[PDB]
Amino acid sequence: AVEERVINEEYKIWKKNTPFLYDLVMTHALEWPSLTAQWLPDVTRPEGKDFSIHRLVLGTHTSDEQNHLVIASVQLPNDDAQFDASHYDSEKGEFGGFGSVSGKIEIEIKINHEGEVNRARYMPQNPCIIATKTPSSDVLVFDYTKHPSKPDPSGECNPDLRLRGHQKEGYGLSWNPNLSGHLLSASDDHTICLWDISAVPKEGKVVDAKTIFTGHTAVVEDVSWHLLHESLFGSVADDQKLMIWDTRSNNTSKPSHSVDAHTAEVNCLSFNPYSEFILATGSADKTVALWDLRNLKLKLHSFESHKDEIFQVQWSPHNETILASSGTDRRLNVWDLSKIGEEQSPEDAEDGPPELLFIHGGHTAKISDFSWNPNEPWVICSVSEDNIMQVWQMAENIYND
């Protein structure tokens, strides 16, 4: 009651203050909340039109209803149309005008999925193949080009590929941008599964476990390949442990590198799309730690801006020195590496350290998952728990000055 009221008041204040702070807001209410959300590299810019089309991949969470993996199309204003003289309002004194032309979000393809979609990431050199996690042991692989767009009346799902190697559900899935068919998955079974689908036969359905890792003594929260290296990957697990593995190693139980992360459990990690030595990890001690691959003993920096556990951390494909991270504080924080160690007055310091650059608080509940747009700059799609998917973008005067 009181918490709901204060959250509603905060959301109303954010609604009133958004025009001064944001440039592009697209708030949509999904049919069901999504545990994951990721953009696709392909962008559509039809000739003779003043808008662009982007593609998003999301999941669904239903207690007793058939879950659908969703590929959706989002319409955004054109870059050229951003500077147009339409009208003028004498009251506000700005080139405003409510009008009716705007973008809109449509659901394009829905594919039946056994259980909740824990995580859905496309494989980088072909958006056709999409990998999803299940509450069961297996990991599913779909292809929307090899599947009817609308869901089939049959309740049972028809995955294009089913992968075995785990014994129960998990929450970490990653692809390899440099080698085709390589996939990493994590689960509560204390093991990390590495699979190769490049050698799967045309009519083959079941994929065996290529590699199993068991170095961790606790829940392997997340795994991810290196964005530049071809055989190195990282993992973070609830034993407060960061783990660097090389697939060329002859031992799957003896790690290449093992480091303690924090005093609390860690959730996820992400590498730079440009750099190759800096990795960001999020923990439950209200900190996000940067680590250099030159020396893993000492933390590069320990950003501290949240009040609780932080779940998802992603970098910016457009800018090398920009990080984004969300937790259960319902705030998506955008952080800059160009303001590190910069003196500030206390008036700019009560809210937080200069390490932070931006805070987004337009989500009523925990931010389930966010993703950057690989084509448009600063556009971030964040899905929260109350089936709220916001395609937001902060003001151009806060990062460019």
Binding site: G48, E106, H229
Partner: protein, 176 residues
């Protein structure tokens, strides 16, 4: 790069108002706003987006006053209406709305000093032009690049041959 990593591991003007902004919300009955914002406030900062902004804008709801629909809006947002279609069979034999029947009616009703083979040739040429236009409807958008030929004259001999031939294609044909 990989080897090094492995080794190391081991009206006013638009330009004065800035870019336009978009604010669209699903729960708001108020329509999506597409306009530029230029109010300068030192309290609405990215660090504290929830800070109060006195003397800038009142903190009151506007969607309820702007749009209180409570009407049969037919629910045309999406999910219904675009796919629906109807098809039937028409009759066009009495008042022929066709190019061949149209030309036949024009020739029958209106008679001029034109030869019948000439009229047939004209009708065939018109049909061919209509077919060409129908095939050409697939061009869709096509930007135009300006084409200009300079003041070339027969006195000069060093001018471009291509332009000379292009204008030769537009020569003068005299009649005896």
């Amino acid at each position: 790069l990989c080897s090094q990593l492995d080794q190391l591991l081991q009206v006013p003007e638009r330009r004065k108002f800035g870019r336009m902004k978009l604010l669209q919300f699903c729960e708001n009955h108020r329509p999506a706003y597409w306009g530029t914002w230029n109010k300068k406030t030192a309290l609405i900062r990215a660090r504290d987006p929830w800070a109060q902004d006195t003397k800038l804008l009142d903190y009151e709801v506007d969607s309820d006053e702007e749009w209180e629909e409570e009407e049969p809006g037919e629910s045309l947002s999406h999910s219904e209406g675009d796919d629906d279609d109807d098809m039937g069979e028409d009759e066009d034999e009495d008042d022929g709305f066709f190019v061949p029947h149209g030309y036949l009616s024009e020739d029958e009703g209106v008679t001029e000093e034109c030869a019948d083979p000439e009229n047939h040739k004209v009708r065939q040429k018109l049909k061919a032009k209509e077919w060409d236009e129908f095939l050409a409807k697939g061009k869709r958008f096509r930007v135009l690049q300006p084409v200009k030929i300079g003041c070339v004259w027969a006195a000069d001999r060093d001018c471009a041959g291509d332009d000379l031939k292009v204008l030769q294609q537009f020569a003068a044909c005299f009649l005896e």
